[PDB]
Symmetry: D3
Subunit: 293 residues, 6 copies
Amino acid sequence: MVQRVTIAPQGPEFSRFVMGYWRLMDWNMSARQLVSFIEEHLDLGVTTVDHADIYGGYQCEAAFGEALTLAPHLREKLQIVTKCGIATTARAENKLGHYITDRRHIILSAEQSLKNLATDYLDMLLIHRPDPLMDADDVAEAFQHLHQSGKVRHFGVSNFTPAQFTLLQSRLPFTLATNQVEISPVHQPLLLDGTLDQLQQLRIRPMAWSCLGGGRLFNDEAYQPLRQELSVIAQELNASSIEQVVYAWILRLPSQPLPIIGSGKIERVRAALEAETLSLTRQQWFRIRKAAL
Amino acid sequence: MVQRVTIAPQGPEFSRFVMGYWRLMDWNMSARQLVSFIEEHLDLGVTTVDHADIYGGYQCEAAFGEALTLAPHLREKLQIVTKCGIATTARAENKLGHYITDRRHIILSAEQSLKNLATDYLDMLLIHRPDPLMDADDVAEAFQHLHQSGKVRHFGVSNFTPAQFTLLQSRLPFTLATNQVEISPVHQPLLLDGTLDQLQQLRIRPMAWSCLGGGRLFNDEAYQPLRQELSVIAQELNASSIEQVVYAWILRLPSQPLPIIGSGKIERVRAALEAETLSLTRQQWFRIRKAAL
Amino acid sequence: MVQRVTIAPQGPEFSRFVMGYWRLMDWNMSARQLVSFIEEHLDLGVTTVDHADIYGGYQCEAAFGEALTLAPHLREKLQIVTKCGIATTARAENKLGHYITDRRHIILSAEQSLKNLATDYLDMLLIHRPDPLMDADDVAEAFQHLHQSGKVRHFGVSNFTPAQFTLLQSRLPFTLATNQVEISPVHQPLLLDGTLDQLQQLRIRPMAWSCLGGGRLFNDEAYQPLRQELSVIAQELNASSIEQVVYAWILRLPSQPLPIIGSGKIERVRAALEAETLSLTRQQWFRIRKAAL
Amino acid sequence: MVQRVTIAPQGPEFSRFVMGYWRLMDWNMSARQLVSFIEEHLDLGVTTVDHADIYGGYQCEAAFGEALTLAPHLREKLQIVTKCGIATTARAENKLGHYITDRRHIILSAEQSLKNLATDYLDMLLIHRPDPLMDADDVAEAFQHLHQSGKVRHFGVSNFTPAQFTLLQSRLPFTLATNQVEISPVHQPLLLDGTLDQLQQLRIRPMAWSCLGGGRLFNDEAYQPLRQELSVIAQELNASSIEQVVYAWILRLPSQPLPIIGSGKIERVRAALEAETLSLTRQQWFRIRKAAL
Amino acid sequence: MVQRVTIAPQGPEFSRFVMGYWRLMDWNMSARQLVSFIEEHLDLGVTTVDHADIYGGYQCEAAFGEALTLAPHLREKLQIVTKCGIATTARAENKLGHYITDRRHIILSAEQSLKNLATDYLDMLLIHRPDPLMDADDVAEAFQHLHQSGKVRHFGVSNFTPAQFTLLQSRLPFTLATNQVEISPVHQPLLLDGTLDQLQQLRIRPMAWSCLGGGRLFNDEAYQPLRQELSVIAQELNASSIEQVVYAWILRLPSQPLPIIGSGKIERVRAALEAETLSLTRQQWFRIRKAALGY
Amino acid sequence: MVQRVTIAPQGPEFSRFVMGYWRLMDWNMSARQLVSFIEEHLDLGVTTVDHADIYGGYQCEAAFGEALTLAPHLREKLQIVTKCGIATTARAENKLGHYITDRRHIILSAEQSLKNLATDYLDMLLIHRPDPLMDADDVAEAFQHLHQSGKVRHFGVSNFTPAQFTLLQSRLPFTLATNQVEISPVHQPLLLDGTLDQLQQLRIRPMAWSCLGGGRLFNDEAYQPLRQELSVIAQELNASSIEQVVYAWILRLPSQPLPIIGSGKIERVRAALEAETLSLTRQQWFRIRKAALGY
């Protein structure tokens, strides 16, 4: 089973690996098929799932909720994370992509999330992106309302700089439970730009997205000779695949990230979860870093 | 007319818009013409005015003082902000442009400002630029003397990074009342680099300079189709001019900036002030941002 | 009188200083007032004037043509340059700013320019900006048509890289007569990036726009201590103003630029034309360069 | 079905779209399944195919050759492009990834390619990457031997700068037939950096790789609202998928690129090919560019 | 003689100028010649010396300890600073250069340092470079153990960003006593990027390395015209040499850096210490800055 | 002995390694000691020597000419390269560093060079740096005059972009014989920015300066771990020193550079020339590249 992990002080207990549903609509699953898939990754210990209001042209939440309506007993076994803050052109009233982080929008988005997902509470709500118009007082008013009514148990952010993180935190009487950020051998700036230093310092563990380079590792022909060094290291470790090596690479980070898995096929999930057992050496970790840069 | 605003905790009360006098020598006004102009913007509710020792080759403060000696009753109605820290070659001793932030210079500069402006106090004194040779103990000692003697009511900085700001603040018994910074659709890095994040967190409102791009919006042929998108949004808001839309764009920031007006023509001042009544939508705000980038 | 200058091999004879009309609508002139202004700068030897289809929300060409209709004898004494290639949102069918460099648009734009300016020929037509969709074959087809019909006597470009310049040139049986580019102490990259090297090499003289920093020199408070070094040098040369020093700085360049003047007030034009008589030293030229960088 | 195109002066005739086999080992196809796939895209008019010695840990060429030995009649219907120049650690001799562009390596690589692909000629051989140790005389000697012997019909390069291209071309009696380069809404610098300017000038059409962003368009959560603007334009064009709109975006370039398709699923190939019939407006093209930036 | 300075709150007392020994192996000194050199800079007031486990291919520490063994009275007269955290290919087991900041490596490195330098305590131990794999709890455990046993008196870092500095500091019950960083007219980003602001704010003085541009000032043809602008300002100050001017320029910084001297020539050390008496004005400082950038 | 090479079409024949004299004043040589040093590198086959009007505060040329005056037979045995175009504050009339590339200054500079070096001709004259005020017609006039009179045999440039190079070349009836540029594992942008591509294309060989990183390789603490990766490859090649490895790395470039040696120690010159016989493989070259970048 996947390890159980407290992601922040007084924060929730998650599974170390998180199941990401941002691509759910591309998997072409029925509600019944989705139920089986959730049941499958639950049995492997992946209990924490990641959503957002905008995913799938604003349809993934609703589609996930249809599965939860078929199998009502699953809710209790899951930790549901979702997000708000982004406005895309998938909605007709949005003439251009932008951000909305006003109090009322946050409350309305969360409430809609509850309806879509067919549940009466969210485990965590995140601000999806840092908004130049973000009024921390107003976000705090929304969070306080959602918290005191029992509709949202924890709050965090996504893709925030440390200064943006500290601004919002300064308004809240509880700890921001995460800062969901992009971490992989393909995208390493947060390792040294201060983001991951801050998170380690506050003992807040990031949920890590785009762990496989946002598709570049396998589909960007320019990383093909890089696939090779992960292969060479894979065989040193007797790892079954290069994905396991990349996940191990991420887990090795001292901020102790929780990797988000995005594949809608189950033993690529299982393959991912085998990274918990690979002991990377430092030289193997740095060999990967340099092969990628 | 123009709103009254407290710019910081334990800070002064300023007008939301600030009249900037850095171009005063270029306006070719008699002392009596300048007296009429001050009275005119005072009647509109613009009471805060912005000076620096160096402006106009060290001439603008003295010119303003000529007006105040002719009309002594004006001083009590104004909040005078001036600065020190830059040394230009308009003075023979300065063989190159550089910075000077030593304790004695600050005090002597403030004292000369009083003499120039024909007043016995300043509402606020700013360090004009961050100086790599800035000793914060030295600045603090200067500020402390100016404060206890009643010569200067409040202190702030200009164009400081968050680290430079924190450094000086650490030495001071009172709160720095502002960080005067460049903010416009043409110059946006401070929106995301942490400068405005820190000011919002501390509830310190920045005075905003180069609000119209330091001349570029109207005089740079390259921004001329951009000037056209502001015209399109102006027509939507039924605004009489595009500068109104720009000022509304800045006011919309959650750090709540106080824009500095630099025009010596009173109808351009009045035109600016109707920005307070403009209802800029988020989408309009982001369209402006995108068109400028 | 202003010097007469051949700007390219087999190219037209221009005045060394060019009168720019991109801001004509902001000057608030009647047709009668504009006539007087043209007559005034003509008598000083400024015969070459610069237009574009998009200027003034597509109105400057027409406004200039009204003056030419009042005083028909002026056409013969002027060299008219205009441009096409940019599409702005000042026209309702343009939902966003973009470029159009298709054959038919170029021909139609030129033909409209002839109607607006109330004349039967243009001295030079320029591609206003380098378009990623630019098909050099199609531009060449348009130029050939306009040339062989006698509607346009010469052709050039604006803001092109040397590779973009060479691409278009490779299609044309005559020499591109200029590459209109931004040159000033405030914007110096073209001095070393290869643009001005290419122009000198081909003996093609650039028309230089934004010569005074697109408004920054006088209106960007951050260049105020830089105004000072131009002042110090102005007095060494006994120059009447800093504009004359900046123009002299530009004229000193070995690509031998033709500065475009944009002020609608006549002895700032006259003041500009006095730069022909200032002999800058190299040390003065480099002192300016370093004061600006 | 797919248009026939001559890619350069004295160059070969290719299909407008190219089938890329760099992912072939990941498709898990039997030799007979691969034979069916080749026949399927041949029937759609896709005849040009793209290989490299290194692809799939030096396995994709040989796998393709298994198909050609089973179906010998196919070779005459195909144009085979392959490459050399990169040395990866999938071979034991290579202790680090590097480049090898020495004369003997090029010849031996081309010869191994023939053996791998079970054919006695290649339609085109490319240098895979610009090598700081590239001696253009050495490459030229290799190309000359391969050409005179009839083993290779044409020669080109991949990812070269205009200076690297010019350098190699200077040594060759025949024209380099392509510069295979990365082009997509996600990666646009080549549009303006001179690479595509030079190819259009020489009337050489580039083969375009990573047309869909090297996986980012669909697998990078960060481009997911961007994926939505392509959906909006798709609906305007009544296109069945967004990749069609992307391919139409690339085809719209005046260098006239030949996009490389990398999907081993035949219906994704067919979906791509209907891009030829799509009428992309300039405004649509620029909206896509802006939404990606 | 060289002024003595408290480098941090609760921190040790160092000499304002620091003798750096990273180039020791290249000087080709016998152990006896090294004794004399140490005694000579000691006489001038230079008591603080800077080492690292990796210097000279893991050889410089041991070469220094041979001198200390011949002259054991010198030990008490010195403040010895050393470092760990970098792994170089001078050790066969390291197939590539990388970082090691685990607890047991830090402890074992410090203990090897003690054996190499032939002494039972270090005055200060530094983390040589920020390691993306740095676990601050682990470093704190190591530092705690070394402090508990008397083996190491004070602790600091080298080349840390302010966020890396704050991270490590959060775990420690004692103040980090320095952040050793690169400062010269040739390399100025730390003047404005927050590194030196943080140090001034915390009243922690940095040790400054590559004070003369890492060799470039004298050995890079491209700085020869700049070198000559330093000579003009030298003449104005009646300074014996341009090294004095550069050191004076660094000392003028309000973080109050301690310059590390790396020359094995006592003549040049002496010429460094004379910078303490130089009256560098603001315009001279700024003229220097600009000559170096091109401003 | 050092191979001889034709540096350009119609160009002069140089030694593959070039003795650079920009640091001459710092060596503290008497004129007689300089004679011996010249004779010693001459014996090893180093015949081409590199000077500039500005070097050593406008002193190095004249110091060299004093040696040539004591030993006038040496002149014919050397190819002398010098430069003009830079104005430094070592001359009182220059209140700031800048460039001067006007016709009469070029002519007067070359003529001063002749007087300084105590010789009646220069083998090659270079424009030292690209000048934004460079008027190529003016330079061509100067070069024409100097060529017409026999005072200068060949012409080239230093630190030019390819567009600056092409600009000047367009005006000249003879081929520019070199573009002297910076090349080292420490400074690699010219490998891929088109500078070296253009030179290879035109079959013009660059003279390479700052081959050892302008002092950084040895004097910058931050390259000490890299210095040690060069030592690993040295051992693999049985190379006496890492300087040999670096020179071999530069020689491997297909533009076929001529390295400028700047050491006044004949021991180190000798150790440079041994690079000609080193078998640097591709993987070794690339390992070096990557150790220097961090790739």
